[PDB]
């Protein structure tokens, strides 16, 4: 039973949420290998844990940059939520700690690369291929939303393909535990629901709108609303006229009209029947929800794996020395990390 599985998941989550793991490793326990990704106030590196020989992805956030960008609370959210969750399609946090300069979150290394990379290269995914990925997101959001979590940054750049061809969601930087409404303007322009753009209070329905954007992008090869500059993107989103490629199936277009729905009383995911409106839609009729969860479905695409620690499925980024100051920076701000 789903309700029973979700109630026990909540019990597990709540214990960790109320008593977060803290200071479970140290920087000197890892060898830093290569940069896998970069952001505004940090980077993620491939590292090897010397005691086990396991490879991990280490997210290193500069405390001073976090503060400058007013992402303190968001970063505390990210670590507190990530250490508490447990789901097959969420990248697992293994360790966290901090030093004088930086915050560190050490996570499972997912060697197949970002969905983004494969999607751009290949161009688009077939509807069955897209449906396979989409089902995993639907179940992940079912899980997260049940814990009163909104994710708030669904995009192909945050979805990693594992050695079995299944998705792992990463980056909980905008994730938040909220009952009822919140107001922060955040996300990625192409994926923002109209409520967010219009500065209304919003809720978990913004994740379901974002799923619509992801499915469209996977199946079309480009998102439903794009332009050279974000303001032009926002104009397109708030007008809400979506045009579908002629190759989209009838079922696909109907699902997307119900996800990309400006009207919150009509948006799938947000109605009295909840996620079951999505799970029971015609486009998902061939999806065995149980088998997806269990990883028993054969994946449409399996990534090339050259060995442990291989980064061939990732782009190259400029490397920069990790500096640890001899003075503690921003101690009070990150006390609970």
């Amino acid at each position: 039973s789903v309700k029973e599985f979700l109630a026990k998941a909540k019990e597990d989550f709540l214990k960790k949420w109320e008593n977060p793991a803290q200071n479970t490793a140290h920087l000197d326990q890892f060898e830093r290998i290569k940069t896998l990704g970069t952001g505004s106030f940090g980077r993620v590196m491939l590292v090897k844990h010397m005691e086990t020989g396991n490879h991990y992805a280490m997210k290193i956030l500069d405390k001073q940059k976090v503060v400058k960008l007013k992402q303190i609370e968001h970063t505390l959210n990210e670590k507190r939520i990530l250490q508490a969750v447990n789901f097959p399609f969420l990248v697992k946090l293994e360790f966290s700690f901090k030093d004088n300069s930086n915050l560190y979150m050490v996570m499972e290394y997912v060697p197949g690369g970002e969905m983004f990379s494969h999607l751009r290269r290949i161009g688009r995914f077939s509807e069955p291929h897209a449906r396979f990925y989409a089902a995993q997101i639907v179940l992940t959001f079912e899980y997260l939303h049940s814990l009163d979590l909104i994710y708030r940054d669904l995009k192909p750049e945050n979805l990693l393909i594992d050695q079995q061809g299944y998705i792992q969601v990463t980056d909980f930087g905008f994730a938040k535990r909220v009952k009822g409404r919140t107001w922060t303007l955040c996300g990625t322009p192409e994926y923002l629901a109209p409520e967010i753009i219009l500065s209304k209070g919003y809720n978990k329905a913004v994740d379901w709108w974002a799923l619509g954007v992801l499915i469209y992008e996977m199946a079309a090869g480009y998102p439903p609303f794009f332009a050279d500059q974000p303001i032009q993107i926002y104009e397109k989103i708030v007008s809400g006229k979506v045009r579908f490629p002629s190759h989209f199936s009838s079922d696909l277009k109907d699902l997307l009209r119900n996800l990309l729905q400006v009207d919150l009383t009509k948006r799938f995911g947000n109605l009295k029947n909840g996620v079951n409106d999505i799970k029971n839609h015609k486009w998902f009729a061939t999806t065995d929800w149980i088998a997806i969860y269990q990883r028993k479905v054969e994946a449409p695409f399996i990534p090339k794996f050259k060995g442990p620690g291989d980064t061939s499925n990732f782009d190259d980024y400029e490397e920069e020395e990790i500096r640890v100051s001899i003075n503690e920076k921003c101690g009070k701000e990150f006390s609970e990390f």
């Binding site: 505004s40 968001h74 955040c186 990625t188 480009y222 794009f226």
Partner: peptide, 20 residues
């Protein structure tokens, strides 16, 4: 084509997060 318009756009690379 819409594909052509996308590929010619400045938003085919990794898209950064926005916040207020």
């Amino acid at each position: 084509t819409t594909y052509a318009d996308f590929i010619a756009s400045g938003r085919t690379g990794r898209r950064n997060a926005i916040h207020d």
